[PDB]
Amino acid sequence: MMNPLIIKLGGVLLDSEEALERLFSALVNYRESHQRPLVIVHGGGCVVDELMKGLNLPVKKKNGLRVTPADQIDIITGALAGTANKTLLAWAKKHQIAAVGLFLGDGDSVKVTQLDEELGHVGLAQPGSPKLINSLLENGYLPVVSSIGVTDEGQLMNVNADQAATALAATLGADLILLSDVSGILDGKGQRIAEMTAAKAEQLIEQGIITDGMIVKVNAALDAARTLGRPVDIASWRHAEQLPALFNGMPMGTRILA
Amino acid sequence: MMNPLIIKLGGVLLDSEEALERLFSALVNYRESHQRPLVIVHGGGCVVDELMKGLNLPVKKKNGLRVTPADQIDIITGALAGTANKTLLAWAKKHQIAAVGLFLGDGDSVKVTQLDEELGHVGLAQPGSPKLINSLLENGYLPVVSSIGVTDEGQLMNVNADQAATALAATLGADLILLSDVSGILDGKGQRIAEMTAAKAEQLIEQGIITDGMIVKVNAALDAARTLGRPVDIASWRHAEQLPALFNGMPMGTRILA
Ligand SMILES: Nc1ncnc2c1ncn2[C@@H]1O[C@H](COP(=O)(O)OP(=O)(O)NP(=O)(O)O)[C@@H](O)[C@H]1O
Ligand SMILES: Nc1ncnc2c1ncn2[C@@H]1O[C@H](COP(=O)(O)OP(=O)(O)NP(=O)(O)O)[C@@H](O)[C@H]1O
Ligand SMILES: CC(=O)N[C@@H](CCC(=O)O)C(=O)O
Ligand SMILES: CC(=O)N[C@@H](CCC(=O)O)C(=O)O
Ligand SMILES: [Mg+2]
Ligand SMILES: [Mg+2]
Numbered sequence: 245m246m247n248p249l250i251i252k253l254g255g256v257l258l259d260s261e262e263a264l265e266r267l268f269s270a271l272v273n274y275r276e277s278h279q280r281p282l283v284i285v286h287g288g289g290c291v292v293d294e295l296m297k298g299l300n301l302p303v304k305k306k307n308g309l310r311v312t313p314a315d316q317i318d319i320i321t322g323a324l325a326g327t328a329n330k331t332l333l334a335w336a337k338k339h340q341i342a343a344v345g346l347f348l349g350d351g352d353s354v355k356v357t358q359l360d361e362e363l364g365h366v367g368l369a370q371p372g373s374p375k376l377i378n379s380l381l382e383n384g385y386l387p388v389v390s391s392i393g394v395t396d397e398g399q400l401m402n403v404n405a406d407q408a409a410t411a412l413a414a415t416l417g418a419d420l421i422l423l424s425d426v427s428g429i430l431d432g433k434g435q436r437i438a439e440m441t442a443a444k445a446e447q448l449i450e451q452g453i454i455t456d457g458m459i460v461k462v463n464a465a466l467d468a469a470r471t472l473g474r475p476v477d478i479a480s481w482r483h484a485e486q487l488p489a490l491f492n493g494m495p496m497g498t499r500i501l502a
Numbered sequence: 503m504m505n506p507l508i509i510k511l512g513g514v515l516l517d518s519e520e521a522l523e524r525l526f527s528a529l530v531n532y533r534e535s536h537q538r539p540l541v542i543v544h545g546g547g548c549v550v551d552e553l554m555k556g557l558n559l560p561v562k563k564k565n566g567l568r569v570t571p572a573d574q575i576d577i578i579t580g581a582l583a584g585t586a587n588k589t590l591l592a593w594a595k596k597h598q599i600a601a602v603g604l605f606l607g608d609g610d611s612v613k614v615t616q617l618d619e620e621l622g623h624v625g626l627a628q629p630g631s632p633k634l635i636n637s638l639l640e641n642g643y644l645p646v647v648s649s650i651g652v653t654d655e656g657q658l659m660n661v662n663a664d665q666a667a668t669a670l671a672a673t674l675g676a677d678l679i680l681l682s683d684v685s686g687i688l689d690g691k692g693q694r695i696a697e698m699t700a701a702k703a704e705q706l707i708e709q710g711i712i713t714d715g716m717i718v719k720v721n722a723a724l725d726a727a728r729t730l731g732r733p734v735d736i737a738s739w740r741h742a743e744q745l746p747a748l749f750n751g752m753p754m755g756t757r758i759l760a
Pocket of ligand 5: 254287404405406457461
């Protein structure tokens with residue numbers, strides 16, 4: 245069929261029932277008016293941070309990535325691959341969407357290896373096999389993929405959701421939209437930046453405008469854009485009225501050009 | 503293809519790396535010497551209890567079922583559908599098994615509804631659609647199914663793993679083996695009971711020999727046995743040497759006759 249569209253979800257989205265309702269309303273409307281099959285990839289520092297907080301566990305993120313010790317991978321996996329993933333599956337069911345929950349290791353959709361011993365159980369995601377997901381898409385299911393992966397040696401890995409989404413986009417040859425709490429990438433004044441290139445990203449990074457998580461998000465988007473040969477959008481999930489146009493192609497945030 | 507074989511896992515199994523290794527060794531050996539496709543269903547009060555314990559959260563089980571308040575369903579879902587499920591997926595990968603993680607709601611494999619308001623988010627599992635799992639089995643994957651489900655209204659439900667396994671057995675017309683920490687059902691002296699009938703189960707229950715969780719396990723096994731028209735075994739996963747014969751049909755625990 246057509247190239248699928250991957251919609252990546254994350255941020256505080258999971259903390260808002262209203263936001264989730266409006267989002268799924270837009271997803272149903274899109275699905276029932278488009279032939280391009282959808283695939284959802286999600287993160288959830290939201291469900292994770294709140295949990296780590298309650299557990300008095302520190303949240304150290306080295307260069308945008310969460311240091312994930314061996315004694316914390318199981319609980320993080322529970323929050324991400326379990327709670328976040330199933331919460332989204334429940335919303336899909338509530339809206340009569342036939343969804344199937346998956347993590348990066350299912351059907352070896354996305355290959356993961358240990359990125360850096362200093363990060364612990366943090367995985368480096370690279371393209372895998374599209375066979376399983378393609379079969380699910382052809383059968384009419386909506387794959388909802390978490391960012392937890394597993395190495396060939398059987399070690400669970402926590403993968404940044406933006407990087408996981410980009411790896412899956414390459415695997416499926418899918419278009420990609422990264423939805424976040426903010427309207428794309430902001431400049432030094434907090435204003436939305438309409439278009440992004442590698443040269444500009446480098447500039448902004450050199451100037452300290454793009455920091456933390458956003459450095460990881462932009463680099464992931466740029467990688468996807470150059471791999472696919474198609475633009476990649478970073479936009480917000482916060483405003484109901486913008487969702488339909490967004491899912492249809494209207495630039496609502498930052499469009500990465502490669 | 504042939505009627506699949508569902509192997510249900512639970513208990514303290516997840517706390518033993520050695521036990522997990524020996525189990526998967528036996529699973530690989532079985533798979534490579536049998537045409538009957540395997541399906542794993544798992545519980546995990548193990549990963550859940552230890553977590554609830556550390557959280558100073560009480561574990562109240564009414565009539566063998568864990569009272570699951572709305573404020574605890576997310577964390578239980580994380581432990582069961584996330585941690586337990588992915589831990590098993592990691593072991594499968596370690597042994598080069600192409601597995602796919604699922605929960606009861608995927609492909610509506612097992613239908614779930616609220617069992618009793620007094621239990622909270624505890625689901626009543628009944629047969630669903632075998633289409634998704636049958637397709638995965640035909641494609642060569644090993645489904646690993648958690649006991650978390652979801653109602654049509656989008657509410658996550660915690661389902662007793664034995665009941666979930668029985669509901670799935672009916673859905674798939676699968677043979678069933680329930681693996682636990684003990685060698686089947688024990689009598690008043692703690693000795694293994696070789697065969698079980700509904701009449702005998704009633705007797706033992708009336709005599710207070712079969713209590714708690716075991717009442718739920720036996721009733722689930724008896725239901726499966728009468729639905730399938732085939733015997734159902736309850737046996738232990740603790741002894742390495744018994745696994746091969748067990749998976750092949752040798753009675754190692756309690757065989758439920760219907
Ligand atoms: N120049 C910048 N422009 C925009 N956002 C920035 C910038 N620098 C840093 N950020 C941060 O980038 C965050 C975006 O990345 P991130 O916090 O990981 O959200 P997410 O990827 O949407 N969620 P999730 O998948 O759950 O992690 C924003 O909310 C900002 O705090
Ligand atoms: N007459 C009995 N015979 C055998 N076991 C009994 C009996 N009465 C109670 N039990 C208990 O039944 C338990 C078996 O059920 P359960 O504790 O829920 O394990 P499980 O279903 O294997 N694990 P899981 O899926 O993770 O919940 C045993 O370990 C015993 O504590
Ligand atoms: C390694 C890493 O940073 N992981 C992310 C995965 C979830 C996400 O992107 O929201 C994390 O916060 O734990
Ligand atoms: C409702 C209910 O008892 N659920 C089970 C599910 C896991 C299992 O069987 O191990 C529970 O302990 O939370
Ligand atoms: Mg992020
Ligand atoms: Mg049990």
